């Protein structure tokens, strides 16, 4: 393969450990939905530039939800919405403000890692789970696969683009 392997078309799958999934977001709305149905639900919402605070409807994990969103940047903003238990409300856990429209997720070392902050200085952070292998993802845009060992490149792509 290539080190940067893709693009792959939208699908649902169980990500392999130790590869970055790099998603080229092409629109507003749900970029991906990821859960193991027990303790980990993350959905990322894309919010186009210059959106004043507004309540929008999104379907996530087959549930209509209303999220208040805003973006006061020229860049796109990606909202990580999380719940760690089925009955809890989703909350906005992390954001990534980005000119490149690339969003990253990785299973590595018992945890899920994602990029947050603001390009070109976006950085990674981890999220815990007691069922890492059970996490599946439905990705609604094209994506790429890059080994964790080449995170340096992944970071470059997240921060400066393809």
Ligand X SMILES: CC(=O)N[C@@H]1[C@@H](O[C@@H]2O[C@H](CO)[C@H](O)[C@H](O)[C@H]2O[C@@H]2O[C@@H](C)[C@@H](O)[C@@H](O)[C@@H]2O)[C@H](O)[C@@H](CO)O[C@H]1O
Rounded Cα gap, residues 42 and 58, in angstroms: 13
What's the first-to-final CA gap in the chain, in angstroms?
17
47 versus 158: smaller Cβ distance to ligand X: 158
58 versus 104: smaller Cβ distance to ligand X: 104
65 versus 125: smaller Cβ distance to ligand X: 125
Is residue 128 a contact residue for ligand X (CB under 6 A)?
Answer: no
Is residue 132 a contact residue for ligand X (CB under 6 A)?
Answer: no
Is residue 153 a contact residue for ligand X (CB under 6 A)?
Answer: no
39 versus 151: smaller Cβ distance to ligand X: 151
Contact set for ligand X, span 94-113 (CB under 6 A) = 106, 108, 113
**Binding test (CB under 6 A) with ligand X, winner from 5, 118, 142, 151:** 151
Cα 73 to Cα 22, 50, 69, 102, 119, distances in angstroms: 22, 6, 13, 16, 12
Is residue 142 a contact residue for ligand X (CB under 6 A)?
Answer: no
Which residues in 14-30 are b (16+ Cβ under 10 Å) and which e? ebeeebbbbbbbeebeb
Is residue 148 a contact residue for ligand X (CB under 6 A)?
Answer: yes
Is residue 118 a contact residue for ligand X (CB under 6 A)?
Answer: no
Strand pairing report for 111-118 and 91-98: parallel
Is residue 39 a contact residue for ligand X (CB under 6 A)?
Answer: no
**Binding test (CB under 6 A) with ligand X, winner from 124, 127, 136, 138:** 124
104 exposure class (CB count in 10 Å sphere: 0-12, 13-18, 19+): buried
118 versus 151: smaller Cβ distance to ligand X: 151
128 exposure class (CB count in 10 Å sphere: 0-12, 13-18, 19+): exposed
Give the residues lining the site for ligand X (CB under 6 A): 106, 108, 113, 123-124, 148, 151, 155
């Amino acid at each position: 393969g290539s080190m940067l392997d893709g693009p792959y078309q939208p699908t649902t799958f169980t990500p392999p450990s130790d590869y970055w999934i790099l998603i080229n977001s092409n629109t507003n709305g749900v970029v991906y939905e990821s859960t193991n149905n027990s303790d980990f639900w993350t959905a990322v919402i894309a919010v186009e530039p210059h959106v004043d605070p507004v309540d929008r409807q999104y379907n996530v994990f087959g549930e209509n939800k209303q999220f208040n969103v805003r973006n006061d940047s020229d860049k796109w903003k990606f909202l990580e919405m999380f719940r760690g238990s089925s009955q809890n409300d989703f909350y906005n856990r992390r954001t990534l403000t980005s000119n490149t429209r690339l969003v990253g997720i990785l299973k590595y070392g018992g945890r899920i890692w994602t990029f947050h902050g603001e390009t070109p200085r976006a950085t990674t952070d981890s999220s815990n789970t007691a069922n890492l292998n059970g996490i599946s993802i439905t990705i609604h845009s094209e994506f790429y696969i890059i080994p964790r060992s080449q995170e340096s490149k992944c970071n470059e792509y997240i921060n400066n683009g393809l």
